[PDB]
């Protein structure tokens, strides 16, 4: 009788052991992606293009009469260019005249891979538009396809509707 | 034609910039086009009741305003299809998506526009002729049974400017154009009619023609008339299937409509699975019932607006065919489920509740629903006639008759086919209670019966007297054991048994008893009552003294005659024609009377 | 007389339903006593003592059926109706309270 | 995917009980999930219940204590509550929110489904056929569960409705004249019973086929509302997409109904009948009817909702509204419990409307239908004779009456009384039936055709 | 108990082998998706 | 250490009193102590919640109570149990909670009674009719329940081994008595089986001399469990022997009946009814066990000589 309970505990923990191992593999892959994004932001032209897009997307989501862009200090030259270009593109798309400033007194922690944060005029609404946050957002939403790509499709799943 | 969503408080959506909107109009809210209706209006803002889940609806979403109120789309292709309570084809949604779910915001046209229908004009109309509402300007050939007559929509008239030639047209083309005071209207084969509006008729006529169902009980003793309204109890063990199948299969009506209101999923599956498998002989060919049937399906988890609207969608479809000159029989599977949906909406809108929690207007809605049934003289110059019958069922919680829904229904319907479960447990079918059941159409049908059958009316009166007396004698028998009992009462008891066994009971799983023609029903009852009368006379005319006749003497003397009476139900109308069965019944009567003659 | 005259309450519903169940159980047990006496009576046909016992038992059974239970059922139905009437007047007041709050909110805007 | 950066707001108009009222929110959605960060770093979850212009109102799952209107930030996800589903989550234990509480990892999703889902298109619904045996004789040989029906267990407070629910999870399966799973959701369960369920499933080796959701009495009351929606969302994935049969047991729907009443009050809705929402009917139907068979697929979902009857009155809206939209009832009694009979299930007031299709040749055994009907009649008569005995005495009974008393005593001792760890398959249950029926001579078994008696009665 | 741990180790080894086969391809697609910003104005914006 | 709050105190303190009490309870729980917390009333707490809910003009639920009444009671009731405490010493304490629902009646529709019943594992319902008859302690014992049976079965089987089966038989007798009582009130014992007569008479012995006690007397101020088991063991042992005797000798010549048993060994029932008076603590454990052992030996010899 007691042997049956022991076998139950062994099988149940063994199931969790392999599931945890699979979750570590996913975590390690995500960590590698973050390190590879670090290599990307070490570039100049490729990273500036990301910032050009990221600043525009920040502005389009916040839609306020005044905005402040906060970035890493070392990225200010690149953000400055991104804002100067983003502004006339914003105005054409939205038909609203928005004063976009860059925060020269506060900066993002230097350990952040990259990206920007966008605040409204009174600093009460912020857009989480940093590079690390965007990666986590997409990686999680796309995870069902990562699961299949790495470990295989579910052989017992016949209908995808 | 667009407004914007101002806010969501649950299933209720507030719109702004929606000044041009009428109460109980239709809107398609959000990017998924959720179906809802406008109830309260204030300024340029509107309060929308959304039928489906509102999860995901954003402030700023578009709202598309649809000019028509809750309406039923009427035209070719309606037959054989299964609809949602708000007129959404379930057989197309499940087949155009390959899904098992009804998509949220699903938008499938009620009548497909990819079918090329065979349309023949009336050949009587010409360009320049005058046409009015209800007129028929051509017929679509759907199937072998029901011709789909294309009528001018009500509340339209004028001079005809274009008539399509005979040919293949779909439901998006233009078939007839007419001009009234310089205004040209282009009409297809499809008309739209608000579901809460009653389709006009020329006149509402008395109902005189019986509804010729295939059951001996629920006909001989408790008649229903074409255009009449009845109620049927709906309990698990009551055997309601027998009426549903008998009415939809063998009735003398032309079109059957089966309306679900909000039943259990598995119960809707049984109906949806059974119906397609039913057939009937027509011109010697066995045809599917679905060629002259339409069905509305609603389960308990369907949007409450659809469960509430289902009953009106069904009768709107019924009236549509009524206006063609057809006799239509609509069954509401459970009007209690409808009333439940109605109470839910009243509750959701925070309306003041009345009796047992139901809306104050419950009775008014049921009364105006049933009033829409009846035999009518149709609109249009063809001077055609038709009818709608309603055989809606009631299933109150607990089986009691105190529930306002069943009490109100019984005060409205003129026939009550009270069923029982005890009879089912005893394997006696159809499970008709007899003492509770009644019909108030007996007077209306007296002209029909007099004209065509003559002796039916006194026979059904005697039949009720015999059956009622059997009940009245029950207390005497229980306390006596048929010892201190009159021989005339023994005749009543044993003959009443004969009636209960070999007449009111009917076995629909036998090929000979699938359908009992009226002439056979009255034939069987005539001979049984004629025996009763002869047996009463045999005892009473000899009961003075010395040498008297008793029931034991009659039963022993002519046991073959009592057997022959029981055997009458086996006369299969499919093989033995009207003349042969009547001849055999006539010979039985003669053999019967002669057997009694030997006793005097 | 017509009702047991217990003030409408959920407690009264519980008491009346238990009282009804008791009366129905007693009716059925006494009916079985009567049937047993009736069979024994017919088998014998200490004879008149059975006829007296049956008449007394049937009279009590008839009273339960014609007097006591109808009276409990009328009382229970009375209670059920009156409780729904109390529910309604609570609904009215709560609805008006919600409307007054809505009016206050509109004034504040 | 959205790939749209999230907006976090520090604009708060006020806080009122479980609700936080936000301001200046851009195009908010109804039912949107948001996350709060409190000044102490504490994180909370919530859902948007009302969006009146820019004034979004969010209900916080956890308590709102500590929340201010100056520093607390609210991060919007831009989407609604969608549950990660997979086959792998079978064998896991989750809380009401869908988070693991078994020390395992977060679910590695195969897809994301809206937990509210959609109704199943009636045109493709297939009437229930085969049987799912439970292992409990009182509800296999008397009121079987068809493979696709929804039959509730009504119990009074204090009865062992949770022990039976656990027994069903350990014993239930297919008839077997690998493709069967159970999804178990407990709403408002107290800490002691939550331990019982978790440990009892793990210890007996059944967990491999159970997906367990525990919503504890002290857990957020709104989470109790999604709990059965997460369980059913999983059941729909497993059943209809992965071609297998899923048994769903929803325990203590009465506690669900109470949490639903709380949500209604949060919306400031006027209470309906007996304090419950006027839409309780459609809400229960929304849960219950997401079950059954579907055309073209080999999967199925059954449900056994379990409901505590307040004051043991079947009239109460909770069992009344449930029964009105379910197919029969199991019905656990009190007298059988006080008499120390387990399971305490009363066969006389119970009913399974689908039994006619569940059982018979090709599904269980030829004689199933006949044995059930005769046992019911014999039990009903035995109770009737026992009542007579109390009036007329033992000496006044005839031989037939004594046989019915012998049946009554042995029926309850052999057929109904089982124990929590004896798994009786459908064939053993019927064999026990015959052992009890062979108490009577053939001529007293009026409801069994002679052909069945000649085949099964002897030996 | 050894057979349970033996099967567990084998399953982990399988997952490690499988995920390696296309590890770089999954990372490459993921980096592409996050790098491509695709800015967009909310669909309900009306000016 | 008690917390005192009277009905004339502010409604907020009336609400907070429960939270203060349980906070102290958990505090000492975390010391490894076993804490037992008794509430005087949770209906007064629910009353405070109803009063405040009204004052705040928030939408009420049934009978004026807040819809979250169940959540507040669950929050209190679920703060209890045997735990492994935080801290290096690995100590393990517990909190027991005894609630108290003042009954507007025996109808469990009462919002507070209903919410309590859905949470608490043990419910000791007090019958109104037993109170009127001055049967103390007044417990219905047919509507009450305890959900810890299986948890305690290990304890009982380890230490006593006898209690579990005695408990089962005792519950069977009490329930059988209620069913026999229903018919006896109707037919007056005119027809009863001999076994049924024993059940009725032993059940009265149990109701009067086992389940009833005067808690202000030296002998019943506290009855130690070993003694509770001793008393029940003898009464059921009597039951089994009395039932065996009449069923074994049934349908024979020397038919044994209850009247014969009561006349034959009347002093046995007197001794059984006297067991409550052995007076623990004043008298010793060793003697009380020996005295009950003697009662069992006398009953066995009394039935042996009868049969």
Swiss-Prot record, chain A:
Keyword set includes Chloroplast: no
Keyword field: Acetylation, Cell membrane, Cytoplasmic vesicle, Hydrogen ion transport, Ion transport, Membrane, Phosphoprotein, Synapse, Transport
Record flagged with keyword Nucleotide-binding: no
Molecular-function GO term, any one: proton-transporting ATPase activity, rotational mechanism
Origin superkingdom: Eukaryota
Bilayer topology: Peripheral membrane protein
Tissue expression per record: Expressed in brain (at protein level).
Compartments, record wording: Apical cell membrane; Cytoplasmic vesicle, Secretory vesicle, Synaptic vesicle membrane; Cytoplasmic vesicle, Clathrin-coated vesicle membrane
GO BP: any one term: synaptic vesicle lumen acidification
GO annotations of cellular component type: apical plasma membrane; clathrin-coated vesicle membrane; cytoplasm; cytosol; endosome; extrinsic component of synaptic vesicle membrane; microvillus; vacuolar proton-transporting V-type ATPase, V1 domain
Principal location: membrane
Job description of the protein: Subunit of the V1 complex of vacuolar(H+)-ATPase (V-ATPase), a multisubunit enzyme composed of a peripheral complex (V1) that hydrolyzes ATP and a membrane integral complex (V0) that translocates protons. V-ATPase is responsible for acidifying and maintaining the pH of intracellular compartments and in some cell types, is targeted to the plasma membrane, where it is responsible for acidifying the extracellular environment.
Quaternary structure and interacting proteins, as annotated: V-ATPase is a heteromultimeric enzyme made up of two complexes: the ATP-hydrolytic V1 complex and the proton translocation V0 complex. The V1 complex consists of three catalytic AB heterodimers that form a heterohexamer, three peripheral stalks each consisting of EG heterodimers, one central rotor including subunits D and F, and the regulatory subunits C and H. The proton translocation complex V0 consists of the proton transport subunit a, a ring of proteolipid subunits c9c'', rotary subunit d, subunits e and f, and the accessory subunits ATP6AP1/Ac45 and ATP6AP2/PRR.
Annotated family: Belongs to the V-ATPase E subunit family.
Annotated protein name in UniProt: V-type proton ATPase subunit E 1
Organism: Rattus norvegicus (Rat)
Lineage: Eukaryota, Metazoa, Chordata, Craniata, Vertebrata
Curated annotation (Swiss-Prot), chain D:
One GO term describing the cellular component: extrinsic component of synaptic vesicle membrane
Keyword Ubl conjugation applies: no
Domain of life of the source: Eukaryota
Annotated tissue distribution: Expressed in brain (at protein level).
Keywords: ATP-binding, Cell membrane, Cytoplasm, Cytoplasmic vesicle, Hydrogen ion transport, Ion transport, Membrane, Nucleotide-binding, Synapse, Transport
Annotated Pfam families: ATP-synt_ab, ATP-synt_ab_N, ATP-synt_VA_C
Subcellular location per the Swiss-Prot or TrEMBL entry: Apical cell membrane; Melanosome; Cytoplasm; Cytoplasmic vesicle, Secretory vesicle, Synaptic vesicle membrane
Keyword Disulfide bond attached: no
SUPFAM superfamilies tied to this protein: P-loop containing nucleoside triphosphate hydrolases
Coarse class of the protein's main subcellular location: membrane
CDD domains: ATP-synt_V_A-type_beta_C (cd18112), ATP-synt_V_A-type_beta_N (cd18118), V_A-ATPase_B (cd01135)
GO biological-process terms attached to the record: ATP metabolic process; regulation of cellular pH; synaptic vesicle lumen acidification; vacuolar acidification
Chain residues that bind ATP: 353
Any one GO molecular-function label of the UniProt entry: proton-transporting ATPase activity, rotational mechanism
UniProt cross-references to HAMAP family, sorted A to Z: ATP_synth_B_arch (MF_00310)
Assembly and oligomerization: V-ATPase is a heteromultimeric enzyme made up of two complexes: the ATP-hydrolytic V1 complex and the proton translocation V0 complex. The V1 complex consists of three catalytic AB heterodimers that form a heterohexamer, three peripheral stalks each consisting of EG heterodimers, one central rotor including subunits D and F, and the regulatory subunits C and H. The proton translocation complex V0 consists of the proton transport subunit a, a ring of proteolipid subunits c9c'', rotary subunit d, subunits e and f, and the accessory subunits ATP6AP1/Ac45 and ATP6AP2/PRR.
General function of this protein: Non-catalytic subunit of the V1 complex of vacuolar(H+)-ATPase (V-ATPase), a multisubunit enzyme composed of a peripheral complex (V1) that hydrolyzes ATP and a membrane integral complex (V0) that translocates protons. V-ATPase is responsible for acidifying and maintaining the pH of intracellular compartments and in some cell types, is targeted to the plasma membrane, where it is responsible for acidifying the extracellular environment.
Protein family: Belongs to the ATPase alpha/beta chains family.
Protein name: V-type proton ATPase subunit B, brain isoform
UniProt source species: Rattus norvegicus (Rat)
Lineage: Eukaryota, Metazoa, Chordata, Craniata, Vertebrata
